[PDB]
RNA sequence: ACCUCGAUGUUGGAUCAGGACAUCCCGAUGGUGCAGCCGCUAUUAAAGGUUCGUUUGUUCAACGAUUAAAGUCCUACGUGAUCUGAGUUCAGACCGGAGUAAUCCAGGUCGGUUUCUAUCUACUUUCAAAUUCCUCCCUGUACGAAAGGACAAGAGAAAUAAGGCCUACUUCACAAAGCGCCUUCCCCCGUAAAUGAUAUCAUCUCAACUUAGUAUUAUACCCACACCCACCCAAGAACAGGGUU
RNA sequence: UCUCUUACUUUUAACCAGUGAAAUUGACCUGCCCGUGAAGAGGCGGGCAUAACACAGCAAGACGAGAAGACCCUAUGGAGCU
RNA sequence: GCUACCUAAGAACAGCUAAAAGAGCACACCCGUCUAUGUAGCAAAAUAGUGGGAAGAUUUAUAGGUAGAGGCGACAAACCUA
């Protein structure tokens, strides 16, 4: 089934400039209090999450280094310690992960 | 910017606010338990030709029911939940044939309602209701707004009409929508199994209005006429109606007296305006049965 | 019509769906925090809690062991489930996992979600937090709460 | 449910039913406005190369709860006038026939067992 | 035996005689019956040899003598499973191993 | 004022049907060579309905079993950008006949490819009014010499159609379905009669008029409107809708 | 296969992101009924209807689109065979 | 260099039954019966299933030959670079 006639620019404009076709303005956008970058509500802030993910990756690299090879998951809990930190009574009997940097403010 | 009620509330403020609003709703509902103690609208005796208000009930589900003759009838359970009279309109004001009562059912959140509706309910002093339905009544059947309605409004042996939105099947083809026979499976039939055949005639260069074509089926109001009331449970406000009513379970149905000409003037024995429990003349039992209904707790029936 | 259908259709079919979820769950047990498409994460979440329940049911239990053997492709994780994850949650009766929506994926613009087991060693997520009690609206309502409790 | 071209077991004393034949008796027609035949529905058979009326007495298809369901589709041969061809019915016969509209007294009389 | 309280079999001289007897008893029944009592149907009107009327507690069979002899309803109801005509009937047998012979 | 056989988007079927009345059935009447049951004939009526199978012989034909009846037609075969036999109709092949042959038949038989992603018009829950059969009563009555055998009114059972539903049963299993269950409401206008003039009788009246007569049916359904973060849903392609105390 | 169809899965689908064809197209501000035009009308006459725009279905019309046909006829046009 | 046929020198054919074969079942291999899909396609002839043959008038690689008034043909007017 082929078009019987060429559709005009007038009719085409009516189709493609319809509100239905148009991009809708978003009202979800707020400033993240932590970093000041824009976040959509209901969604984790991209900047803050990227920061957390970078740190998580570093810790995981260290975890892999200590484990050595595959199929070496520990049968005890894990704890991450930074520079100038010692294991506590709770941290005793846990796997210790050492980081070469200082504690982040957000990490508690 | 978009806002919801608990957007700006603290961790400890959310439970407090929830409790506060819930308690106020409970209080408002409890306030309206005695309409006769409050200044009522005049109660008139039943007359031929008169029509009384109906109810809004929730479809609980279905169970079997037996009769003394031995026949099994399936029944639908309709629970009456926070059913109140909301509004009265005179015939002149409505610009219609009859006076109207707006009646609401099934209380819902205040936070999820529009300001207009909230204001209306505030003036009433009742928590907002999910659905409001309009009942055409005579003048002598007028009830003061705020008056609660109960399942005992209906009585066993009475016939009712039930109206609800049917279960929405979404977009359906002709076979499920209109019961078109379709085309055979094998013996050719390249791409024709479930298709509509010839839509119209050759001579007309068009398709008639109201031709049966694929589209959205369900999710529309339908009325089931002449359903018998087998049983009332006064404690839980349950109406046992014969057969199946439209809609899914946990939906809201509009229940009124049967419009069928056979059951035109059988409203004589029924409580005319409504049933007022606070009247307290011959306090009704937990269960009201029809004569034919095999009551639970009765001895095993023998066909003598 | 799909009234009351509780499971998504994903992968190459029913078996494939199980296998996809199994891989996500194995990832979660190992890493304790997993990024994946939102729908897949939401589907897997239920299985995550159920697995902890079977973990709690006991190491010695043969039924729980069989389940754990199936759902964990890497076998080293099976001790971890029984000896680390299950003892961690012994106090609480549920809500073991935490799921949060993540900015859409770069390539395919897919809705994304992070899922973690609660009480993990990893750096805490930037979780959404309700407004402070010291805000103006919260102060007004605290006043109201005080007045109500004084009335009683 | 007995339709046209349904093989049928004759539960009767009649010579026509019980005599050996190469093919089983087959339903030619059902005397109901819809093709479907149930208990108490008169049908027409092709039996032993002749057309003969029969009455259905139980079938494989489930019905109302308390009503019995039979493993085989069972018929009783009847003449055009309505009297049974065979003298005795050994196979148990449902009691629902009595209340049903039609000439069921003859069949119940010649029946020996009820289920 | 869950059929009736009383089973009645009578003999008639002619078809016309059978009809006369069957119609009279139903006419007498209608006169004497209660309003709650359901109406009865004369069965086998077209049949020239057998008529039967079913009441609440009674079944009446009106049949010609030659018809009565072959059917022997008297024998069947007195002797439910011990009837002579039941003895000649042999139950069908499925061949063993589910393989037919000859 | 010769024997032909033509035609061939020609015609079947499926799907969905729109319409006409010149009515096949169901409604109401008049006549009868209408005692009653069946009929024959005409008037009015298109709301609803109008079956499943199979070809030994039959020039647009039957046969079997039914039915209330198995209507006659128009719609570009109604309808092939929804589908499908056969024929026109052929590329291969054989039989009978014709022709020296190639080849032909206005004869027979076997085998045999039409694709389409919808631009425009039109349309995509008008709805809320259902018909029919059988059984019983009347009644075995009226009627009739018998044989036979009603109509009104009422009751019960079904089938179909329209609209729903899932308690059971069945396909199955947070649910969707039928093979299951539930509900289904008004009439039709042709005539049959009073009183009574033109035409002091009579006369049902394209006289004024009076009844059967019902007229415009009617009633039912729907009907308030945050934020339009998000989540859930018995709501849904998207969108929209319902719930979030 | 059918009576008589149903349920589920996959593909497709629809929505979001990326890439991005083809046949087709006189111009179109592109309605319905009846009539006219030997049939046949969106556009002509007499009536009627009618804020405007998407998206998803449909195949009644646009003698819907592309070739390739089959039929009849014509050319002092060809060719193969006898 | 496709294809029809031929020439030279080659290669391939599991397993099972068989007095033992242009035998049977049945792989690989060759072909293309029937259906469905596809129809600007994966494809200017394909896919999936189902099929016919599969020690032979078999299938197939290499090199050579026959040329249009012609070749070649287990005649289908077949094939001779869509
Ligand atoms: Mg079908
Ligand atoms: Mg197909
Ligand atoms: Mg095709
Ligand atoms: Mg869903
Ligand atoms: Mg997928
Ligand atoms: Mg012509
Ligand atoms: Mg029609
Ligand atoms: Mg007429
Ligand atoms: Mg025609
Ligand atoms: Mg067409
Ligand atoms: Mg072939
Ligand atoms: Mg909403
Ligand atoms: Mg599409
Ligand atoms: Mg796109
Ligand atoms: Mg182009
Ligand atoms: Mg026209
Ligand atoms: Mg015009
Ligand atoms: Mg469109
Ligand atoms: Mg035009
Ligand atoms: Mg020339
Ligand atoms: Mg020349
Ligand atoms: Mg050689
Ligand atoms: Mg070999
Ligand atoms: Mg061989
Ligand atoms: Mg072989
Ligand atoms: Mg060759
Ligand atoms: Mg040849
Ligand atoms: Mg040739
Ligand atoms: Mg070439
Ligand atoms: Zn941030």
mmCIF file of N, CA and C in Angstrom, chain A:
data_model
loop_
_atom_site.group_PDB
_atom_site.id
_atom_site.type_symbol
_atom_site.label_atom_id
_atom_site.label_comp_id
_atom_site.label_asym_id
_atom_site.label_seq_id
_atom_site.Cartn_x
_atom_site.Cartn_y
_atom_site.Cartn_z
ATOM 1 N N UNK A 1 0.860 -1.217 0.000
ATOM 2 C CA UNK A 1 0.000 0.000 0.000
ATOM 3 C C UNK A 1 0.881 1.247 0.000
ATOM 4 N N UNK A 2 0.836 1.978 -1.119
ATOM 5 C CA UNK A 2 1.717 3.107 -1.369
ATOM 6 C C UNK A 2 0.944 4.416 -1.224
ATOM 7 N N UNK A 3 1.604 5.528 -0.811
ATOM 8 C CA UNK A 3 0.953 6.839 -0.742
ATOM 9 C C UNK A 3 0.415 7.251 -2.107
ATOM 10 N N UNK A 4 -0.828 7.742 -2.129
ATOM 11 C CA UNK A 4 -1.474 8.141 -3.369
ATOM 12 C C UNK A 4 -1.011 9.536 -3.774
ATOM 13 N N UNK A 5 -0.465 10.280 -2.803
ATOM 14 C CA UNK A 5 -0.075 11.668 -2.980
ATOM 15 C C UNK A 5 1.020 12.020 -1.980
ATOM 16 N N UNK A 6 1.852 12.995 -2.361
ATOM 17 C CA UNK A 6 2.882 13.556 -1.503
ATOM 18 C C UNK A 6 2.215 14.339 -0.374
ATOM 19 N N UNK A 7 2.645 14.075 0.867
ATOM 20 C CA UNK A 7 2.202 14.854 2.013
ATOM 21 C C UNK A 7 2.955 16.181 2.031
ATOM 22 N N UNK A 8 2.211 17.265 2.272
ATOM 23 C CA UNK A 8 2.744 18.616 2.210
ATOM 24 C C UNK A 8 3.516 18.934 3.485
ATOM 25 N N UNK A 9 4.263 20.044 3.445
ATOM 26 C CA UNK A 9 5.039 20.507 4.583
ATOM 27 C C UNK A 9 4.116 21.076 5.663
ATOM 28 N N UNK A 10 2.947 21.587 5.256
ATOM 29 C CA UNK A 10 1.960 22.133 6.176
ATOM 30 C C UNK A 10 1.388 21.019 7.053
ATOM 31 N N UNK A 11 1.004 19.896 6.424
ATOM 32 C CA UNK A 11 0.431 18.768 7.145
ATOM 33 C C UNK A 11 1.513 18.082 7.980
ATOM 34 N N UNK A 12 2.730 17.994 7.430
ATOM 35 C CA UNK A 12 3.839 17.331 8.097
ATOM 36 C C UNK A 12 4.244 18.115 9.343
ATOM 37 N N UNK A 13 4.251 19.454 9.242
ATOM 38 C CA UNK A 13 4.559 20.315 10.375
ATOM 39 C C UNK A 13 3.549 20.091 11.499
ATOM 40 N N UNK A 14 2.270 19.930 11.132
ATOM 41 C CA UNK A 14 1.197 19.699 12.087
ATOM 42 C C UNK A 14 1.407 18.382 12.833
ATOM 43 N N UNK A 15 1.914 17.364 12.124
ATOM 44 C CA UNK A 15 2.147 16.056 12.714
ATOM 45 C C UNK A 15 3.349 16.105 13.656
ATOM 46 N N UNK A 16 4.448 16.720 13.206
ATOM 47 C CA UNK A 16 5.719 16.555 13.897
ATOM 48 C C UNK A 16 5.983 17.666 14.917
ATOM 49 N N UNK A 17 5.112 18.686 14.969
ATOM 50 C CA UNK A 17 5.232 19.755 15.954
ATOM 51 C C UNK A 17 4.089 19.691 16.968
ATOM 52 N N UNK A 18 3.371 18.562 16.967
ATOM 53 C CA UNK A 18 2.319 18.259 17.924
ATOM 54 C C UNK A 18 2.924 18.146 19.323
ATOM 55 N N UNK A 19 2.298 18.760 20.362
ATOM 56 C CA UNK A 19 2.687 18.556 21.763
ATOM 57 C C UNK A 19 3.048 17.131 22.180
ATOM 58 N N UNK A 20 2.352 16.147 21.590
ATOM 59 C CA UNK A 20 2.573 14.726 21.816
ATOM 60 C C UNK A 20 3.999 14.349 21.412
ATOM 61 N N UNK A 21 4.486 14.957 20.321
ATOM 62 C CA UNK A 21 5.799 14.674 19.761
ATOM 63 C C UNK A 21 6.889 15.406 20.543
ATOM 64 N N UNK A 22 6.532 16.551 21.139
ATOM 65 C CA UNK A 22 7.481 17.463 21.760
ATOM 66 C C UNK A 22 8.066 16.849 23.032
ATOM 67 N N UNK A 23 9.292 17.275 23.368
ATOM 68 C CA UNK A 23 9.955 16.920 24.614
ATOM 69 C C UNK A 23 9.275 17.690 25.745
ATOM 70 N N UNK A 24 9.015 16.984 26.854
ATOM 71 C CA UNK A 24 8.358 17.534 28.031
ATOM 72 C C UNK A 24 9.412 18.045 29.013
ATOM 73 N N UNK A 25 9.119 19.195 29.633
ATOM 74 C CA UNK A 25 9.974 19.811 30.640
ATOM 75 C C UNK A 25 9.894 18.976 31.919
ATOM 76 N N UNK A 26 11.046 18.802 32.581
ATOM 77 C CA UNK A 26 11.161 17.991 33.786
ATOM 78 C C UNK A 26 11.191 18.891 35.020
ATOM 79 N N UNK A 27 10.436 18.482 36.051
ATOM 80 C CA UNK A 27 10.274 19.238 37.285
ATOM 81 C C UNK A 27 10.894 18.482 38.463
ATOM 82 N N UNK A 28 11.674 17.434 38.160
ATOM 83 C CA UNK A 28 12.256 16.559 39.167
ATOM 84 C C UNK A 28 13.632 17.063 39.598
ATOM 85 N N UNK A 29 14.165 18.053 38.871
ATOM 86 C CA UNK A 29 15.566 18.433 38.980
ATOM 87 C C UNK A 29 15.763 19.294 40.226
ATOM 88 N N UNK A 30 16.654 18.826 41.111
ATOM 89 C CA UNK A 30 17.038 19.536 42.319
ATOM 90 C C UNK A 30 18.554 19.485 42.497
ATOM 91 N N UNK A 31 19.069 20.399 43.327
ATOM 92 C CA UNK A 31 20.482 20.456 43.663
ATOM 93 C C UNK A 31 20.759 19.413 44.744
ATOM 94 N N UNK A 32 21.771 18.573 44.493
ATOM 95 C CA UNK A 32 22.305 17.654 45.486
ATOM 96 C C UNK A 32 22.990 18.460 46.590
ATOM 97 N N UNK A 33 22.579 18.297 47.872
ATOM 98 C CA UNK A 33 23.139 19.080 48.978
ATOM 99 C C UNK A 33 24.628 18.835 49.225
ATOM 100 N N UNK A 34 25.092 17.624 48.890
ATOM 101 C CA UNK A 34 26.439 17.170 49.201
ATOM 102 C C UNK A 34 27.463 17.831 48.279
ATOM 103 N N UNK A 35 27.169 17.863 46.972
ATOM 104 C CA UNK A 35 28.166 18.227 45.974
ATOM 105 C C UNK A 35 27.760 19.477 45.193
ATOM 106 N N UNK A 36 26.451 19.739 45.106
ATOM 107 C CA UNK A 36 25.949 20.930 44.440
ATOM 108 C C UNK A 36 25.663 20.709 42.956
ATOM 109 N N UNK A 37 26.024 19.522 42.453
ATOM 110 C CA UNK A 37 25.650 19.091 41.116
ATOM 111 C C UNK A 37 24.168 18.733 41.105
ATOM 112 N N UNK A 38 23.550 18.831 39.923
ATOM 113 C CA UNK A 38 22.125 18.581 39.779
ATOM 114 C C UNK A 38 21.848 17.084 39.848
ATOM 115 N N UNK A 39 20.808 16.740 40.611
ATOM 116 C CA UNK A 39 20.288 15.386 40.677
ATOM 117 C C UNK A 39 18.792 15.425 40.387
ATOM 118 N N UNK A 40 18.324 14.412 39.657
ATOM 119 C CA UNK A 40 16.908 14.102 39.588
ATOM 120 C C UNK A 40 16.517 13.517 40.942
ATOM 121 N N UNK A 41 15.415 14.014 41.525
ATOM 122 C CA UNK A 41 14.799 13.361 42.672
ATOM 123 C C UNK A 41 14.545 11.905 42.290
ATOM 124 N N UNK A 42 14.355 11.033 43.290
ATOM 125 C CA UNK A 42 14.060 9.616 43.099
ATOM 126 C C UNK A 42 15.247 8.850 42.504
ATOM 127 N N UNK A 43 16.316 9.566 42.131
ATOM 128 C CA UNK A 43 17.516 8.966 41.562
ATOM 129 C C UNK A 43 18.719 9.451 42.367
ATOM 130 N N UNK A 44 19.668 8.540 42.620
ATOM 131 C CA UNK A 44 20.926 8.872 43.271
ATOM 132 C C UNK A 44 21.699 9.867 42.409
ATOM 133 N N UNK A 45 22.299 10.863 43.076
ATOM 134 C CA UNK A 45 23.152 11.863 42.454
ATOM 135 C C UNK A 45 24.303 11.165 41.735
ATOM 136 N N UNK A 46 24.513 11.549 40.470
ATOM 137 C CA UNK A 46 25.486 10.925 39.585
ATOM 138 C C UNK A 46 26.907 11.129 40.109
ATOM 139 N N UNK A 47 27.210 12.363 40.536
ATOM 140 C CA UNK A 47 28.538 12.768 40.975
ATOM 141 C C UNK A 47 28.932 12.011 42.241
ATOM 142 N N UNK A 48 28.046 12.048 43.246
ATOM 143 C CA UNK A 48 28.252 11.411 44.539
ATOM 144 C C UNK A 48 28.412 9.902 44.371
ATOM 145 N N UNK A 49 27.586 9.308 43.498
ATOM 146 C CA UNK A 49 27.600 7.875 43.248
ATOM 147 C C UNK A 49 28.892 7.460 42.549
ATOM 148 N N UNK A 50 29.385 8.321 41.648
ATOM 149 C CA UNK A 50 30.610 8.074 40.900
ATOM 150 C C UNK A 50 31.796 8.052 41.860
ATOM 151 N N UNK A 51 31.766 8.967 42.837
ATOM 152 C CA UNK A 51 32.761 9.088 43.892
ATOM 153 C C UNK A 51 32.809 7.799 44.713
ATOM 154 N N UNK A 52 31.626 7.308 45.113
ATOM 155 C CA UNK A 52 31.484 6.116 45.939
ATOM 156 C C UNK A 52 31.967 4.893 45.158
ATOM 157 N N UNK A 53 31.660 4.863 43.854
ATOM 158 C CA UNK A 53 31.991 3.750 42.976
ATOM 159 C C UNK A 53 33.500 3.653 42.752
ATOM 160 N N UNK A 54 34.166 4.813 42.675
ATOM 161 C CA UNK A 54 35.609 4.888 42.501
ATOM 162 C C UNK A 54 36.310 4.263 43.706
ATOM 163 N N UNK A 55 35.826 4.603 44.908
ATOM 164 C CA UNK A 55 36.374 4.101 46.159
ATOM 165 C C UNK A 55 36.116 2.602 46.294
ATOM 166 N N UNK A 56 34.906 2.169 45.911
ATOM 167 C CA UNK A 56 34.496 0.772 45.969
ATOM 168 C C UNK A 56 35.408 -0.074 45.083
ATOM 169 N N UNK A 57 35.739 0.463 43.900
ATOM 170 C CA UNK A 57 36.587 -0.200 42.920
ATOM 171 C C UNK A 57 37.994 -0.408 43.480
ATOM 172 N N UNK A 58 38.519 0.617 44.167
ATOM 173 C CA UNK A 58 39.850 0.588 44.756
ATOM 174 C C UNK A 58 39.934 -0.483 45.841
ATOM 175 N N UNK A 59 38.900 -0.541 46.692
ATOM 176 C CA UNK A 59 38.801 -1.509 47.774
ATOM 177 C C UNK A 59 38.736 -2.923 47.196
ATOM 178 N N UNK A 60 37.994 -3.086 46.090
ATOM 179 C CA UNK A 60 37.800 -4.375 45.441
ATOM 180 C C UNK A 60 39.104 -4.872 44.817
ATOM 181 N N UNK A 61 39.907 -3.938 44.284
ATOM 182 C CA UNK A 61 41.224 -4.236 43.738
ATOM 183 C C UNK A 61 42.115 -4.815 44.838
ATOM 184 N N UNK A 62 42.027 -4.217 46.034
ATOM 185 C CA UNK A 62 42.783 -4.621 47.210
ATOM 186 C C UNK A 62 42.299 -5.978 47.722
ATOM 187 N N UNK A 63 40.978 -6.205 47.658
ATOM 188 C CA UNK A 63 40.362 -7.457 48.080
ATOM 189 C C UNK A 63 40.912 -8.593 47.219
ATOM 190 N N UNK A 64 40.932 -8.370 45.898
ATOM 191 C CA UNK A 64 41.438 -9.333 44.933
ATOM 192 C C UNK A 64 42.923 -9.631 45.125
ATOM 193 N N UNK A 65 43.684 -8.595 45.504
ATOM 194 C CA UNK A 65 45.118 -8.684 45.735
ATOM 195 C C UNK A 65 45.401 -9.588 46.934
ATOM 196 N N UNK A 66 44.602 -9.432 47.997
ATOM 197 C CA UNK A 66 44.795 -10.155 49.244
ATOM 198 C C UNK A 66 44.343 -11.608 49.095
ATOM 199 N N UNK A 67 43.239 -11.816 48.362
ATOM 200 C CA UNK A 67 42.655 -13.132 48.144
ATOM 201 C C UNK A 67 43.613 -14.001 47.331
ATOM 202 N N UNK A 68 43.987 -13.512 46.141
ATOM 203 C CA UNK A 68 44.915 -14.195 45.254
ATOM 204 C C UNK A 68 44.237 -15.331 44.493
ATOM 205 N N UNK A 69 43.923 -15.070 43.219
ATOM 206 C CA UNK A 69 43.293 -16.045 42.342
ATOM 207 C C UNK A 69 41.797 -16.196 42.618
ATOM 208 N N UNK A 70 41.059 -16.992 41.803
ATOM 209 C CA UNK A 70 39.620 -17.181 42.000
ATOM 210 C C UNK A 70 39.294 -18.205 43.087
ATOM 211 N N UNK A 71 38.014 -18.222 43.489
ATOM 212 C CA UNK A 71 37.420 -19.175 44.419
ATOM 213 C C UNK A 71 38.087 -19.088 45.793
ATOM 214 N N UNK A 72 38.280 -17.852 46.274
ATOM 215 C CA UNK A 72 38.974 -17.604 47.530
ATOM 216 C C UNK A 72 38.162 -16.652 48.410
ATOM 217 N N UNK A 73 36.830 -16.798 48.381
ATOM 218 C CA UNK A 73 35.942 -15.989 49.205
ATOM 219 C C UNK A 73 36.125 -16.360 50.676
ATOM 220 N N UNK A 74 36.384 -15.374 51.571
ATOM 221 C CA UNK A 74 36.612 -15.652 52.991
ATOM 222 C C UNK A 74 35.339 -16.104 53.701
ATOM 223 N N UNK A 75 35.525 -16.836 54.806
ATOM 224 C CA UNK A 75 34.431 -17.366 55.605
ATOM 225 C C UNK A 75 34.229 -16.501 56.851
ATOM 226 N N UNK A 76 34.838 -15.307 56.834
ATOM 227 C CA UNK A 76 34.735 -14.320 57.901
ATOM 228 C C UNK A 76 34.347 -12.971 57.296
ATOM 229 N N UNK A 77 33.864 -12.065 58.156
ATOM 230 C CA UNK A 77 33.470 -10.715 57.780
ATOM 231 C C UNK A 77 34.703 -9.903 57.382
ATOM 232 N N UNK A 78 34.464 -8.810 56.645
ATOM 233 C CA UNK A 78 35.512 -7.943 56.125
ATOM 234 C C UNK A 78 35.343 -6.537 56.702
ATOM 235 N N UNK A 79 36.476 -5.849 56.901
ATOM 236 C CA UNK A 79 36.511 -4.463 57.344
ATOM 237 C C UNK A 79 37.638 -3.734 56.608
ATOM 238 N N UNK A 80 37.384 -2.465 56.263
ATOM 239 C CA UNK A 80 38.326 -1.636 55.527
ATOM 240 C C UNK A 80 38.909 -0.598 56.483
ATOM 241 N N UNK A 81 40.245 -0.575 56.573
ATOM 242 C CA UNK A 81 40.956 0.377 57.413
ATOM 243 C C UNK A 81 41.900 1.221 56.561
ATOM 244 N N UNK A 82 41.886 2.531 56.830
ATOM 245 C CA UNK A 82 42.705 3.509 56.131
ATOM 246 C C UNK A 82 43.967 3.777 56.951
ATOM 247 N N UNK A 83 44.740 4.800 56.556
ATOM 248 C CA UNK A 83 45.997 5.126 57.217
ATOM 249 C C UNK A 83 45.721 5.721 58.597
ATOM 250 N N UNK A 84 46.517 5.288 59.580
ATOM 251 C CA UNK A 84 46.441 5.776 60.949
ATOM 252 C C UNK A 84 45.240 5.215 61.706
ATOM 253 N N UNK A 85 44.802 4.011 61.310
ATOM 254 C CA UNK A 85 43.692 3.324 61.952
ATOM 255 C C UNK A 85 44.125 1.919 62.364
ATOM 256 N N UNK A 86 43.625 1.483 63.527
ATOM 257 C CA UNK A 86 43.905 0.167 64.079
ATOM 258 C C UNK A 86 42.593 -0.598 64.252
ATOM 259 N N UNK A 87 42.589 -1.950 64.125
ATOM 260 C CA UNK A 87 41.386 -2.747 64.389
ATOM 261 C C UNK A 87 40.911 -2.596 65.832
ATOM 262 N N UNK A 88 39.586 -2.498 65.997
ATOM 263 C CA UNK A 88 38.945 -2.436 67.301
ATOM 264 C C UNK A 88 38.622 -3.849 67.787
ATOM 265 N N UNK A 89 37.890 -3.931 68.907
ATOM 266 C CA UNK A 89 37.449 -5.190 69.493
ATOM 267 C C UNK A 89 36.485 -5.904 68.544
ATOM 268 N N UNK A 90 35.626 -5.121 67.874
ATOM 269 C CA UNK A 90 34.672 -5.621 66.896
ATOM 270 C C UNK A 90 35.409 -6.052 65.628
ATOM 271 N N UNK A 91 36.419 -5.264 65.238
ATOM 272 C CA UNK A 91 37.163 -5.456 64.000
ATOM 273 C C UNK A 91 38.109 -6.651 64.113
ATOM 274 N N UNK A 92 38.386 -7.084 65.351
ATOM 275 C CA UNK A 92 39.201 -8.261 65.610
ATOM 276 C C UNK A 92 38.435 -9.505 65.162
ATOM 277 N N UNK A 93 39.131 -10.378 64.424
ATOM 278 C CA UNK A 93 38.537 -11.576 63.849
ATOM 279 C C UNK A 93 37.828 -11.294 62.526
ATOM 280 N N UNK A 94 38.122 -10.127 61.936
ATOM 281 C CA UNK A 94 37.643 -9.746 60.616
ATOM 282 C C UNK A 94 38.837 -9.605 59.676
ATOM 283 N N UNK A 95 38.582 -9.784 58.373
ATOM 284 C CA UNK A 95 39.573 -9.549 57.334
ATOM 285 C C UNK A 95 39.821 -8.046 57.227
ATOM 286 N N UNK A 96 41.105 -7.668 57.238
ATOM 287 C CA UNK A 96 41.517 -6.273 57.223
ATOM 288 C C UNK A 96 41.929 -5.902 55.800
ATOM 289 N N UNK A 97 41.352 -4.801 55.303
ATOM 290 C CA UNK A 97 41.705 -4.218 54.018
ATOM 291 C C UNK A 97 42.402 -2.887 54.290
ATOM 292 N N UNK A 98 43.627 -2.756 53.768
ATOM 293 C CA UNK A 98 44.451 -1.578 53.986
ATOM 294 C C UNK A 98 44.367 -0.665 52.766
ATOM 295 N N UNK A 99 44.150 0.630 53.030
ATOM 296 C CA UNK A 99 44.113 1.654 51.999
ATOM 297 C C UNK A 99 45.224 2.670 52.255
ATOM 298 N N UNK A 100 45.836 3.141 51.161
ATOM 299 C CA UNK A 100 47.020 3.987 51.203
ATOM 300 C C UNK A 100 46.637 5.448 51.443
ATOM 301 N N UNK A 101 45.336 5.753 51.344
ATOM 302 C CA UNK A 101 44.831 7.111 51.497
ATOM 303 C C UNK A 101 44.143 7.271 52.853
ATOM 304 N N UNK A 102 43.689 8.502 53.129
ATOM 305 C CA UNK A 102 42.990 8.855 54.354
ATOM 306 C C UNK A 102 41.509 8.501 54.237
ATOM 307 N N UNK A 103 40.823 8.510 55.389
ATOM 308 C CA UNK A 103 39.386 8.298 55.476
ATOM 309 C C UNK A 103 38.654 9.421 54.744
ATOM 310 N N UNK A 104 37.698 9.094 53.840
ATOM 311 C CA UNK A 104 36.757 10.088 53.320
ATOM 312 C C UNK A 104 35.835 10.572 54.436
ATOM 313 N N UNK A 105 35.390 11.829 54.320
ATOM 314 C CA UNK A 105 34.494 12.452 55.283
ATOM 315 C C UNK A 105 33.153 11.720 55.321
ATOM 316 N N UNK A 106 32.673 11.320 54.136
ATOM 317 C CA UNK A 106 31.374 10.689 53.956
ATOM 318 C C UNK A 106 31.386 9.245 54.452
ATOM 319 N N UNK A 107 32.528 8.563 54.281
ATOM 320 C CA UNK A 107 32.750 7.234 54.833
ATOM 321 C C UNK A 107 32.843 7.340 56.353
ATOM 322 N N UNK A 108 31.996 6.565 57.044
ATOM 323 C CA UNK A 108 31.911 6.578 58.498
ATOM 324 C C UNK A 108 32.055 5.147 59.030
#
